[PDB]
């Protein structure tokens, strides 16, 4: 009963220590209905070739790591058919199952917060008339590390202040967002299912990110073990993904 198996595509995920799973905002993902629709063309629904688990490049968690984030649909930009479907149409909508995985030993301790936050509009790094540049909120699968270094082009950079949720809001009220905690003594995986959420029936996969996945460790990773450094891996599967207004491929 701490087991979970989720099958999505041709893909199946397994975890032997999980804490339940969370369904965002209490609503399971669905295809867009006739009542709510706007775009009058027939959507394209790739089904199994699209709604499947895409797993991104892993990140490394150390004694020093103070947080990371990714943006969706962005992180999936280059992933398979979901990716290609993303730039061939104006519009798309999708829900996701997000499965974050980090394992350790009964001899390590650490705690991650895994939050999926809607319309996460982050804050500029500096004062005055700056904003954030397109490229910096569209990292692809690699995401943003919080780095103490000085950076390329700072007037365009986002704040590195993670305990401010990057948005100028207190971390630790970060809960009213769909979330789980990965706490090594207790679990191993985190799992979140989300429905499309947006004030419009379908939006641009290119110019707008509906969700941001942000994981910042609120309990620092401590061990006496030889492996004092462990990977966190993100796999996310789109669900009920549909696209419309097809044209040529945007670059």
């Amino acid at each position: 009963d701490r087991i979970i198996q989720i099958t999505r595509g041709d893909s199946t995920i397994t975890s032997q220590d999980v804490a339940n799973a969370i369904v965002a905002y209490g609503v399971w993902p669905h295809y867009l209905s006739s009542k709510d629709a706007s775009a009058i063309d027939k959507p394209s629904q790739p089904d199994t070739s699209s709604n499947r688990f895409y797993t991104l490049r892993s990140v490394t968690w150390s004694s020093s790591s103070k947080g990371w984030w990714w943006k969706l649909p962005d992180a999936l930009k280059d992933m398979g058919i979901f990716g290609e479907n993303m730039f061939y149409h104006y519009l798309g909508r999708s829900g996701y199952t997000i499965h974050v995985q980090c394992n350790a030993s009964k001899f390590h301790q650490g705690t991650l917060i895994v939050a999926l936050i809607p319309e996460h509009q982050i804050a500029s790094a500096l004062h005055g008339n700056v904003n954030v540049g397109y490229n910096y909120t569209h990292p692809g699968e690699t995401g943003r590390e919080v780095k103490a270094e000085t950076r390329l082009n700072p007037d365009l950079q986002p704040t590195e202040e993670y305990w401010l949720n990057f948005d100028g809001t207190l971390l630790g009220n970060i809960t009213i967002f769909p979330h789980q905690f990965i706490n090594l003594r207790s679990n191993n995986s985190a799992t979140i299912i989300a429905p499309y959420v947006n004030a419009v029936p379908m939006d641009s996969m290119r110019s707008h990110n509906n969700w941001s996945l942000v994981i910042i460790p609120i309990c620092p990773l401590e061990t006496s073990s030889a492996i004092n450094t462990i990977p966190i891996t993100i796999s996310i599967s789109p669900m009920c993904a549909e696209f419309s207004g097809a044209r040529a491929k945007r670059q």
């Binding site: 198996q5 989720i6 099958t7 041709d10 032997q16």
Partner: protein
């Protein structure tokens, strides 16, 4: 309704693949323990979203009856015919084994015990060493344990008063006949973990002793030197077998023994080496 269903070869069918759906649950069918000695129960539909497909395929050909029910060579007996008063010699004797030819031996040795009736088929061929052949007739007599064994092309035992003999003559078609399952026990032993009363001769040597197949050229003294090579073929009919074993991995050395070792030769399986395991 089974004259029909087996004419297109359809009794014994393979299950269909059912459609399958995205699973999210505490039920992990992919997760088992192979430590139990049990093979996993998982099916395609359990770990992947599958479509419905109606499977028309058939296991008929894979049945024990199909597999053992083809004849293959179990012995080759060469009779070199001499004329040194012709009667002192010119007979085969063979102790009867499925064990002297590798191809059928490997197949039946897939099982620990086997039971079946046998169809023996003969393919005699006369190699002519003189200007000609003449009229060659041959006799093949089955000489069960204890029956008198012929010591000369001559001796009375070819009278075959109660034994079974079959005759072939040049130009006649391949002889054939059937045998009923002959063991003294409920099945034939393909392997035996025990010895004789004298604590000797480990293995199958002990179990199935069928006696011998004896050949003689029956045509009386004549002038042409010839060789006669009769090859013996064996089909299994009406078959059951029990306790499958792993298949023989190495060449066969000797009959009735599992010995695999060979002199001054590396011990060589059928496995094939790779340079490295990250490349196929």
């Amino acid at each position: 309704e089974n004259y029909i269903d087996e004419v297109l070869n359809e009794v014994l069918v393979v299950p269909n693949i059912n459609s399958s759906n995205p699973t999210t649950s505490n039920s992990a069918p992919a997760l088992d323990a192979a430590e139990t000695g049990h093979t996993s129960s998982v099916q395609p539909e359990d770990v992947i979203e599958t479509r419905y497909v109606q499977t028309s395929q058939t296991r008929d050909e894979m049945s024990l009856e199909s597999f053992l029910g083809r004849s293959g060579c179990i012995h080759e007996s060469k009779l070199e015919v001499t004329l040194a008063n012709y009667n002192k010699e010119n007979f085969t004797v063979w102790a009867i084994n499925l064990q002297e030819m590798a191809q059928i031996r490997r197949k039946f040795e897939l099982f620990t015990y086997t039971r079946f009736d046998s169809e023996i088929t003969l393919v005699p061929c006369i190699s002519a060493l003189s200007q000609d052949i003449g009229h060659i007739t041959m006799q093949y007599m089955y000489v069960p344990p204890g029956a008198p064994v012929p010591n000369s092309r001559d001796d009375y035992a070819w009278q075959s008063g109660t034994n079974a003999s079959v005759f072939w003559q040049h130009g006649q078609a391949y002889p054939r006949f059937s045998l009923p399952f002959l063991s003294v026990a409920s099945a034939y032993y393909m392997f035996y973990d025990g010895y004789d009363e004298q604590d000797q001769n480990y293995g199958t040597a002990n179990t199935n002793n069928m006696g011998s197949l004896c050949s003689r050229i029956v045509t009386e003294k004549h002038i042409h030197k010839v060789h006669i090579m009769t090859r013996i073929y064996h089909k299994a009919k009406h078959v059951k077998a029990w306790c499958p074993r792993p298949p023989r991995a190495l060449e066969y050395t000797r009959a009735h023994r599992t010995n695999f070792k060979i002199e001054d030769r590396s011990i060589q399986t059928a496995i094939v080496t790779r340079p490295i395991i990250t490349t196929a």
